[PDB]
Design a protein around this ligand. Structure first.
Ligand SMILES: O=C(C[C@@]1(C(=O)Nc2cncc3ccccc23)CCOc2ccc(Cl)cc21)N1CCN(CCCO)CC1
Lengths: 296, 300
């Protein structure tokens, strides 16, 4: 029993964090094989990069300086070719995630991991992270068996305190640019499929007060959901919620009628899994993984 | 900016998780140097669990009865001893991934990261607080026994908890790494209940200072309070008493934000009286008590 915001074990990623210094700027880099990936703002990026030489980039893996033997840019990520392959390189992939998907963030400062937390890619493409100056280059990831899927690299903090970054190919999530200019996070919405997954987790843990005899059509639920700034629930979401629906004996459209009532009436001084708000940062897979005990 | 429930990076602890099997039972062990630490109830059956005599059960065991597995490598147990509720299995190989570590016993209100494991394999890491009733509101399924709680300040791993049991309310009980249980719990299946839980007042205040550091001031007020008047109001909402130590501890955050500790105490009093009014503090509609003053300073 128990339901916690749980991050993936960060060990495979910790062995990859390095410190990248270029001029006055110091941020984090991801050392995989003989390449160090980091935000290109560490340095007109084509013009700024051409002026740099390999010895300008000081890379440090622990107390060992890695010598840069080449550099190239891929979108908003700088790829620094190093002479030494990372002996701690795990099995990895670069994956681009969709809004609503969750990942673990290994927050780093000066190439040293300081903390790990579970995030969600918001529907407005920002992440509500916890980052201070020097956290740029910190990565987001998931673990599948023994494979690390890198999905995020931190680049900036928007004026509202929310964070923006790219996938490991340097493509930003959201309409953001790596430039000091006026940029604002769009109005955010609630990840509906994730809220339903968290309601199933609450039922698995013994919380049933919110359940009701009612059901709803997928269309009627989406008309209500749109009114409360909730993302539309697709047939794919209903299908993905299948396992949890079968395990608890509560159909997805039956849980949608509970969600609809929670939206129109509130909690009424009650909590669900120790929360007075509807939690949307657990995917259906996160609930299954935690309420079954999958290991890495 | 931003305030998240943040766990310590678990890498230093992952390199220590092993699987310990004894008879039908399989749980987790912590392999540090040439010793594997694990809950002593690994030597029990459900027929023993009501009134186990661990000294008697242990004397009947031999080293080859304990099957220890570090990854896909079976370790050889060359000795065993019991220290309180933890079994110490001497093995013939020192763990090459043994980090710099300490065994620390924590006080209620203290936080730590939990590396939840099954079959010696890490499945997840989350943050916990030792509740005032000495339980932890963890996330553990069967097979998680032996999963450890820790803090990682300055490259050293301070092990503070080893998971042993789940109480009937879904909360968890365990020991420090010397085998001493936190709370009035015993490693027996006899009737045991967690005492009434209370909110960790100093942690709530630390989280209100974190909210002020992050720009949330809506809950602040023009009032102050005496420490005694605050405690009289606090006890009525099932909040732990705030001691002069807690007030002293909150000093740095008070100086950084310019809000006197007893001034923040008066804001807490008001929140307890009025609730949030549809507002949130750091993305929460409840007063959060699982961030210590040290956690707030570290993260902010
Ligand atoms: O898992 C246990 C320990 C056990 C316990 O609490 N285990 C668990 C821990 N966390 C989460 C759980 C989630 C669901 C179910 C069990 C969980 C069983 C329940 O009661 C106690 C009372 C005291 C003590 Cl110290 C330990 C326990 N055992 C079963 C009994 N025995 C194994 C012998 C084979 O039957 C020994 C091992």
């Amino acid at each position: 029993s128990g339901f916690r915001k749980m991050a993936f074990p960060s060990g495979k990623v910790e062995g990859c964090m390095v410190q990248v210094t270029c001029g006055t700027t110091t941020l984090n880099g991801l050392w995989l094989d003989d390449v160090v990936y980091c935000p290109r703002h560490v340095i007109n990026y084509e013009d700024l990069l051409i002026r740099k030489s390999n010895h300008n980039f000081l890379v440090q893996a622990g107390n060992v300086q890695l010598r840069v033997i080449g550099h190239s840019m891929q979108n908003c990520v700088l790829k620094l070719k190093v002479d030494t392959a990372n002996p701690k390189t795990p099995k990895y992939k670069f994956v681009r995630i969709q809004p609503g998907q969750t990942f673990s963030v290994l927050a780093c400062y000066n190439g040293s991991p300081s903390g790990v937390y579970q995030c969600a890619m918001r529907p407005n493409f920002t992440i509500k992270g916890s980052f201070l100056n020097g956290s740029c280059g910190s990565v987001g990831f998931n673990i599948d068996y023994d494979c690390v899927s890198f999905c995020y690299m931190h680049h900036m903090e928007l004026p509202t305190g929310v964070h923006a970054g790219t996938d490991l190919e340097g493509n930003f999530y959201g309409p953001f640019v790596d430039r000091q200019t006026a940029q604002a996070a769009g109005t955010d919405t609630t990840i509906t499929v994730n809220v339903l997954a968290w309601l199933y987790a609450a039922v698995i843990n013994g919380d049933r007060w919110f359940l009701n005899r009612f059901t709803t059509t997928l269309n009627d639920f989406n008309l209500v959901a749109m009114k409360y700034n909730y993302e539309p629930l697709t047939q794919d979401h209903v299908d993905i919620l299948g396992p949890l629906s079968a395990q608890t004996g509560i159909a997805v459209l039956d849980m949608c009628a509970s969600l609809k009532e929670l939206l129109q009436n509130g909690m009424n001084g009650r909590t669900i899994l120790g929360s007075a708000l509807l939690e949307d940062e657990f995917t259906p897979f996160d609930v299954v993984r935690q309420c079954s005990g999958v290991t890495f």
